[PDB]
Amino acid sequence: RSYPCDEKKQVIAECSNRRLQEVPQTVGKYVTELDLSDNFITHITNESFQGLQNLTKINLNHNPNVGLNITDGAFLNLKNLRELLLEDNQLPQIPSGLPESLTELSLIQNNIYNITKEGISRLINLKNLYLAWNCYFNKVCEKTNIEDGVFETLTNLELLSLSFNSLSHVPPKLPSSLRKLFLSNTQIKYISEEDFKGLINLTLLDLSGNCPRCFNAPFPCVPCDGGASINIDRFAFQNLTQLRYLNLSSTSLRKINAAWFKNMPHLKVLDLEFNYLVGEIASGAFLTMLPRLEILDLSFNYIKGSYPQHINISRNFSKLLSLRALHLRGYVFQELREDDFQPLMQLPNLSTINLGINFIKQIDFKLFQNFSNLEIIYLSENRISPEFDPHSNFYHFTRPLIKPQCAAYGKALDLSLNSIFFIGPNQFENLPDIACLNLSANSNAQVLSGTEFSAIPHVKYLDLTNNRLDFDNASALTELSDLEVLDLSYNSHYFRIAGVTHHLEFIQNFTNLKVLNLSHNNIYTLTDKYNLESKSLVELVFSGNRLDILWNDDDNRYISIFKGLKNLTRLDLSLNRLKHIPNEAFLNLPASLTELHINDNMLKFFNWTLLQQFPRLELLDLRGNKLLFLTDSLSDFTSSLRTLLLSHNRISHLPSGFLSEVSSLKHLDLSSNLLKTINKSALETKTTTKLSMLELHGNPFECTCDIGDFRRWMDEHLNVKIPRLVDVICASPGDQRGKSIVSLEL
Amino acid sequence: SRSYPCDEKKQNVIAECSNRRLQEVPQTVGKYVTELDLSDNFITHITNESFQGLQNLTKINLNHNPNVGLNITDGAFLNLKNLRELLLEDNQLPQIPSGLPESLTELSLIQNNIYNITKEGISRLINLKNLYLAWNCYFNKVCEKTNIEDGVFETLTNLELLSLSFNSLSHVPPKLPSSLRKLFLSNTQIKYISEEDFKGLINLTLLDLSGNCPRCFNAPFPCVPCDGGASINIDRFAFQNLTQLRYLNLSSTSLRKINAAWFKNMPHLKVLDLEFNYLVGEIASGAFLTMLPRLEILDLSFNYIKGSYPQHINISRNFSKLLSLRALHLRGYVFQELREDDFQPLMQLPNLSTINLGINFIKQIDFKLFQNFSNLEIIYLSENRISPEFDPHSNFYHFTRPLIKPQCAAYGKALDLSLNSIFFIGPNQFENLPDIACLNLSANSNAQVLSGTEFSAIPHVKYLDLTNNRLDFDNASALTELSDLEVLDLSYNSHYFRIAGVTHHLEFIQNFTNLKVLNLSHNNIYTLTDKYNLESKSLVELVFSGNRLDILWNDDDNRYISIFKGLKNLTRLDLSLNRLKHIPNEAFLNLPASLTELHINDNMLKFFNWTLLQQFPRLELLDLRGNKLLFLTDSLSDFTSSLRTLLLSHNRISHLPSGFLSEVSSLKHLDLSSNLLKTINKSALETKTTTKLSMLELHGNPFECTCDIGDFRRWMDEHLNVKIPRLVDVICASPGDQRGKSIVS
Ligand SMILES: *[C@@H]1O[C@H](CO)[C@@H](O[C@@H]2O[C@H](CO)[C@@H](O[C@@H]3O[C@H](CO)[C@@H](O)[C@H](O[C@H]4O[C@H](CO)[C@@H](O)[C@H](O)[C@@H]4O)[C@@H]3O)[C@H](O)[C@H]2NC(C)=O)[C@H](O)[C@H]1NC(C)=O
Ligand SMILES: *[C@@H]1O[C@H](CO)[C@@H](O[C@@H]2O[C@H](CO)[C@@H](O[C@@H]3O[C@H](CO)[C@@H](O)[C@H](O)[C@@H]3O)[C@H](O)[C@H]2NC(C)=O)[C@H](O)[C@H]1NC(C)=O
Ligand SMILES: *[C@@H]1O[C@H](CO)[C@@H](O[C@@H]2O[C@H](CO)[C@@H](O[C@@H]3O[C@H](CO)[C@@H](O)[C@H](O)[C@@H]3O)[C@H](O)[C@H]2NC(C)=O)[C@H](O)[C@H]1NC(C)=O
Ligand SMILES: *[C@@H]1O[C@H](CO)[C@@H](O[C@@H]2O[C@H](CO)[C@@H](O[C@@H]3O[C@H](CO)[C@@H](O)[C@H](O)[C@@H]3O)[C@H](O)[C@H]2NC(C)=O)[C@H](O)[C@H]1NC(C)=O
Ligand SMILES: CCCCn1cc2c(n1)c(N)nc1ccccc12
Ligand SMILES: CCCCn1cc2c(n1)c(N)nc1ccccc12
Ligand SMILES: *[C@@H]1O[C@H](CO)[C@@H](O)[C@H](O)[C@H]1NC(C)=O
Ligand SMILES: *[C@@H]1O[C@H](CO)[C@@H](O)[C@H](O)[C@H]1NC(C)=O
Ligand SMILES: *[C@@H]1O[C@H](CO)[C@@H](O)[C@H](O)[C@H]1NC(C)=O
Ligand SMILES: *[C@@H]1O[C@H](CO)[C@@H](O)[C@H](O)[C@H]1NC(C)=O
Ligand SMILES: *[C@@H]1O[C@H](CO)[C@@H](O)[C@H](O)[C@H]1NC(C)=O
């Protein structure tokens, strides 16, 4: 049982976020990677790691966790160290006498303003060198000094990142080994033809945020004199024949010199966000130079204060023969016509068009059918009617446009966050065969009645979340006979009113429906039909409703509410304010359940016996309740249960014979409870057990001699992992107070 | 000592002993006690020895015992000669128990399992004024009919209030005392009211017959109609001698016809609740309207015809005979358009102040119609379609809470248009309205750019509610037409705020010369355009809860460092729920010097620079609850002379500095509950002077109960002027024995 770290093969010592004061001295021989991020370590000496020659990767990010002291040659011993992460350590300098074995070194987010030869030029094996985010924004720092020729000695260097430092010119004498070069936000105003002249291997170049476009910047932003464009010499890119990625976002570009791409036949991704390129999108000589380009990002090039009637796309867009994705967020215009996108219509591979955040008031949807294979039509965040992760893209989020669960079904159309407050009879005509539709957050209050989706009747995943839907007709959505996933979360507006009717009967009319989400609808009363019924349904999410009201002891109408979900395997009843479940109501839950969540309720009572009616239940989640008794006879009540989740309850005593003969149970979580001790027969199985994971952190353990039968049990069963031992802590007595229980003389 | 377990206070001696997990009555009750509240504990037995040394009790409350039956002997109570009032609600009692004292003037047996009202239990108690017997047999509880022993209430000739509602009776019991003022028989399974059921009750001011022959369609509880969904049947002459009736409740009694005859001899009738009947026909032609010239409140709500969405509502011209009507509630009638002509009858009523039309799915309104009334104060149009468990002491048919927030309605004429679809306010939206002072436009899906002209037709609005919209704050003259605005709620308009790349402008704030309260809560504010500071000469309160001051004040951004400094008159600032892990010194120092109240609760603060309080001489209250602070300063009075309340509950303090209390000086209230304290060392309570503390909170700390805590107990024994709530929850964590034993024992 490793302590304090958590070990595994995958051979990694996970030692992060554990209030460590110093490199622990207790780590296994077979360990090759040590992760000590997020601790309180302030010193590193050549002792620190002395009995650890086999380490190939150390991670010391974020130490002390709110300046790390490192002795010259501290790691110099570690003769197999390939990767050293020293991010966010308040380091005032590159550490002296780093080992030559390093292929990877990260000094992101430090106070290093001097990039010296003593520092680095030594380390001739480097492939990846990260020096970003040392001087930036309103931080108190100095201009970055790069010793001349410091990088030329690193002749296998492939990735150099110096972003978010004050450099003012590209540094000279860079090794021709380079594949990727990040120079974003370095306050460079001029690129000469010398700067990159030798880098014949470069696949990526990032010059974003030099001469930034500052208007409405969400960060401290300093533009070049007068808002000036960055100045890029005609021949600056002439020997960059392998470039596939070019980031020129926020460089205040008004004009794109086509000749920049004369010698760049492989360009795949061009990022041109936050520029002033309305004019060049209408004209655009440079589009003829990019016949292999697959992704083009021209987001946020809107003219301050303008709201043009229409968008203006050059005919030269038809020359982007390989184009797969076109991002045109934040251009800002009122109407999209069939004609305005003619140049895009013959591109064979264009599968994504993104027009989010343009305040578009109207669109001629028939246009979209005139395309070869659009798969994703993203119109989120428009007007349509009836603090910076260093390792992430700085100019936008990188999560996919459409949830992949929805996109997997086919053609997707995302109309979320609009003003489509009522769906009328022709709203969806002239559309392609949409498989995935997002109407989330449209302030939609209509009564759906079985015809609104008849022009796209093959929708398979329908997102209707965050509306105000009025469920006053039993034929709602029944035109969608292939429906597989229906999300109705956050439609509480009408559900919360007792006096209006509420019809959930249409659920039974689907033959392929597998997942239904009814969460946060405040459901506590229904009209006429009190049961949910489906033959197909496999997961129901019912969190954030009022079962406590539906199952009131004095009302029997909802006693069978879920029973007719004949195929259900997964049911989520969290956040339903449940004090107790009536025995009849619990026994009327579908017997096909394999997963049941009743967490974050106020349960003061669970009848363990009724599990006997649930021969397939593998997971029971009772976290975040107020339970205070565990049955002593669980072996009698289930033989399928694998995982019991009982953290954040008020369990004070673990009964003797609890494990009894529960052979199937593997994961038992009893963290954050009121356990003062565990006794021998609470632990005894005479059977063959599968238990491998047992969570006990956050209990107020009594660290008298009564704790020894459990300490002994830990040694007796090293096959059972107890995570976060350093959080398995002595409450009493006061000297023991704050001790981990394993750290005690018994 | 200090009283224990109960809290003792004086009012009009009350001993609050509620909700403490008491396994039994204490024998540590102050012999001076007159009112004993023991509700919501785990008491399972009551005996003749339970209240042994306790003559002086006039009132006992034992409701909700045991929390999850209560067992009470014959005459456990009669030894209490001064007991007038005895509350035994929700105790799962099989029986009106025996030998209750003759002194009783009030007895409550609401919410038990009693189906036998016998002479044996009830008829000896001739001093009763109020007898509450409701909610023993109802809905789908396992349940026998209520047997009311013949003439069992006739000897209680002091009885003014009898409530038997929510029991199965089938008829009004006969032989009821003529002293009755108030009679509650709602939901008792009565289908017929006879000539004879009320004729000796010439003193009745209130009769409740609601839920007899209920209208059951879409009911939120198990509801059983009368055969054929038939109406309650009430003899023509049933109310003949009810001359004193002020209040009649006939809700949910399936009425289609109101016999104007029922009111012939009811000249004082003031409130008539007819909710949930079938009265659309009567409302259209009601002869009974001519019988009610002193009616003040008429509730006709939820009388809709199922499946009908009529174009207009049909108000009988007879409504104009209700010359005393103050309020008219017509929710849930259901109709599409309100026209000027529809309400003609109402318009010459002198005192009609409240018109309520919530939940009618109305689509179009002729707003100028409202000008034509005498003095409308409240125009409640919430929950429509306008475009550009059951507490036994509550009213069962609706909530009683006000229709308009009092703070808003205090300014004058109120118009509530919350929960509509007024997604855009256009040039004439508000023409021909009266002079509106309080305007509620919450939850209208409104996403427009407010530009300073949208309220021009009601320029004297002083309380504006705009919460839960999607407002696009892109123009610095927004709202500036409202020169008299004092209160502005912009909570939950995060839609556009959360998007970094659109413009956000709050400069309009400085323009208001009368603005006192601004609520910007839960807007997810983390970036604004061009102007980064909030400025106002007048503003007194700003709620900035649930935004991202963690981003606005991130260490490498100086832009928002004086965000709140231009609020020169501010005294209350709320900065809770902003995810703050630390406030930078300078940003703290730039908070208004006028502050008297600062809330920085429910953030993640690890450190607090106490020294900085030196800049806030008026600061009286500091709320740091729900953070992660480990450190208290040892030199507080070096930094404050003003602080009276310091709230520190739910932090990580496990040590109090030497001298800390009586450092306090002006400090009246210290809350240190839910921390990590093991003791309070003599040092901590040492105190150079004598503490000014009157309240100290310490419960839910993990105290170590060894002779190490004697110091503190003797501190506690000395200073009886320092109250400690919840001593039951001031608990031993260690050793064991004894955890869970209060440090008081
Ligand atoms: C039919 O119509 C009549 C109205 O004409 C209605 O009668 C009202 O019933 C309620 C009880 O539901 C009475 O309200 C209570 O009155 C007492 C004493 O004045 C108060 O103590 C009660 O307050 C308690 O609870 C309150 C909230 O739960 C708390 O504020 C407080 O702490 C108290 O513990 C409560 O206000 C009301 O007095 C009568 N009206 C008259 C004029 O007597 C009746 O309820 C209707 N029937 C149905 C079934 O809805
Ligand atoms: C300008 O555009 C370039 C090219 O698109 C961006 O390069 C991309 O940068 C991100 C984050 O800096 C890289 O992601 C990270 O890299 C590795 C993947 O090997 C992964 O371990 C991390 O989780 C993280 O995903 C991404 O690799 C990189 N793209 C390529 C092809 O190298 C760049 O970020 C943009 N510049 C700015 C300031 O936004
Ligand atoms: C309504 O309920 C549905 C169904 O539970 C929610 O969608 C589901 O969301 C979970 C994420 O919480 C998805 O699980 C994830 O799958 C990915 C990739 O396969 C995996 O990496 C994650 O570890 C996790 O397993 C699940 O796929 C998804 N199901 C579907 C069908 O989309 C939905 O999010 C809920 N809606 C709201 C508004 O909360
Ligand atoms: C937005 O902020 C305002 C100002 O704080 C909120 O209105 C205020 O709400 C508080 C309650 O949090 C009111 O105080 C209470 O008032 C009653 C009446 O005296 C009293 O019984 C209580 O002791 C308490 O003091 C305060 O009066 C009120 N102020 C105004 C001007 O209305 C408002 O609720 C917030 N809005 C939202 C949606 O959260
Ligand atoms: C007060 C509401 C009574 C029953 N009712 C009427 C409804 C409705 N439920 C409901 N849920 N929606 C409606 C939409 C348009 C017109 C009428 C209705
Ligand atoms: C991507 C938008 C750039 C700046 N901008 C344009 C806006 C706006 N912010 C904003 N907040 N609202 C708008 C409403 C209508 C038309 C344009 C805008
Ligand atoms: C389109 O993409 C396909 C990959 O599915 C590829 O094989 C083909 O080269 C591309 N065609 C053009 C014209 O770029
Ligand atoms: C729909 O849009 C909302 C908001 O833009 C987003 O949160 C959600 O994931 C989207 N749904 C799908 C299925 O992509
Ligand atoms: C039940 O669910 C399974 C998925 O496990 C599906 O294949 C089967 O068709 C469903 N049964 C019915 C009757 O729909
Ligand atoms: C406005 O309407 C909402 C929704 O009905 C309500 O919660 C809020 O308190 C009302 N505001 C005022 C000021 O009365
Ligand atoms: C400051 O606030 C007080 C209290 O509302 C008010 O009386 C006074 O007029 C305000 N001062 C200014 C300059 O607006």
Swiss-Prot record, chain A:
Record annotation: effect of changing residue 499 to V: In IMD98; increased NF-kappa-B activation measured in a reporter assay; results in increased TLR8 protein degradation
Stated regulation of activity: Activated by RNAs having enough uridines.
Tissue spec: Expressed in myeloid dendritic cells, monocytes, and monocyte-derived dendritic cells.
GO molecular function: DNA binding; double-stranded RNA binding; identical protein binding; pattern recognition receptor activity; RNA binding; signaling receptor activity; single-stranded RNA binding
Biological function: Endosomal receptor that plays a key role in innate and adaptive immunity. Controls host immune response against pathogens through recognition of RNA degradation products specific to microorganisms that are initially processed by RNASET2. Recognizes GU-rich single-stranded RNA (GU-rich RNA) derived from SARS-CoV-2, SARS-CoV-1 and HIV-1 viruses. Upon binding to agonists, undergoes dimerization that brings TIR domains from the two molecules into direct contact, leading to the recruitment of TIR-containing downstream adapter MYD88 through homotypic interaction.
The encoding gene: TLR8
Annotated disorder: Immunodeficiency 98 with autoinflammation, X-linked: An X-linked disorder characterized by onset of recurrent infections associated with lymphoproliferation and autoinflammation in the first decade of life. Mostly males are affected; carrier females may have mild symptoms. Features include mouth ulcers, fever, poor early growth, hepatosplenomegaly, lymphadenopathy, polyarthritis, and non-infectious enteritis.
Outcome, altering residue 359 to A: Abolishes responses to both ssRNA and chemical ligands
Membrane disposition: Single-pass type I membrane protein
Organism: Homo sapiens (Human)
Outcome recorded upon mutating residue 386 to L: In IMD98; gain-of-function variant resulting in increased NF-kappa-B activation measured in a reporter assay
Keywords: Disease variant, Disulfide bond, Endosome, Glycoprotein, Immunity, Inflammatory response, Innate immunity, Leucine-rich repeat, Membrane, Receptor, Repeat, Signal, Transmembrane, Transmembrane helix, Ubl conjugation
PTMs per UniProt: Ubiquitinated by RNF216; leading to degradation by the proteasome.
Protein name: Toll-like receptor 8
Location of the LRRCT domain: 699-746
Family membership noted in the UniProt record: Belongs to the Toll-like receptor family.
Highest taxon above the source species: Eukaryota
Segment of the intact protein contained: 32 to 819 of 1041
Extracellular compartment spans: 1-746
Effect ascribed to mutating residue 302 to A: Abolishes activation of NF-kappa-B
Coiled-coil region(s): none
Extent of the LRR repeats: 80-101, 102-122, 125-147, 156-177, 178-198, 201-222, 242-263, 266-288, 292-314, 322-343, 349-370, 373-386, 409-430, 433-454, 458-478, 482-504, 512-533, 536-557, 567-588, 592-612, 616-637, 640-661, 664-685
GO cellular component labels: endolysosome membrane; endoplasmic reticulum membrane; endosome membrane; external side of plasma membrane; Golgi membrane; plasma membrane
GO BP: any one term: positive regulation of interleukin-8 production
Residues the record marks as carrying a glycan: 46, 54, 69, 114, 201, 239, 247, 312, 316, 349, 370, 438, 473, 509, 517, 567, 607, 679
Disulphide bridges, residue numbers: 5-15, 135-141, 211-224, 214-221, 406-436, 703-730
Subunit details: Homodimer. Interacts with MYD88 via their respective TIR domains. Interacts with UNC93B1. Interacts with BTK. Interacts with SMPDL3B.
